[PDB]
Amino acid sequence: SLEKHSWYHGPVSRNAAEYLLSSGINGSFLVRESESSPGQRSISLRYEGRVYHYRINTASDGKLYVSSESRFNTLAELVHHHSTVADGLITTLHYPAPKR
C-alpha cells in the first residue's frame, strides 16, 4: 500500500507541506493529495530553502506524469524516475519528508 512509503503523505495541505519540509535539505520531498483539486496529487519539493509544488498529471490512458515526455504506470515508478534525473523538477527527489 502507498501509505507504507515514507514519501507518500496522503491528504496534507500546501501549508502543512512547508511544515513537513521545514528541516529538510535539497531534494527533500513528499507526495500529497491537492486541496485546489481533489483526486489530484502533487509533489512538494525543497530546494535551497524554498518549496516548489508540482502537479502529478493523470493522462487519458491512466499514466502519471510531471513532465509530459516521461509518463509512468504507477506513482512508485514516477518517484523512482525523478529520484535519478530531475527531468523538469528543480532538482531530483532525494529524501522523504518525515511524517507527522
Binding site: 485546489s36 502533487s42 509544488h53 508540482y54 502537479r55
Partner: peptide
Amino acid sequence: EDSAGYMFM
C-alpha cells in the same frame, strides 16, 4: 509558477 502556486513548463 502560476497564480495557484504550482510549477509549469
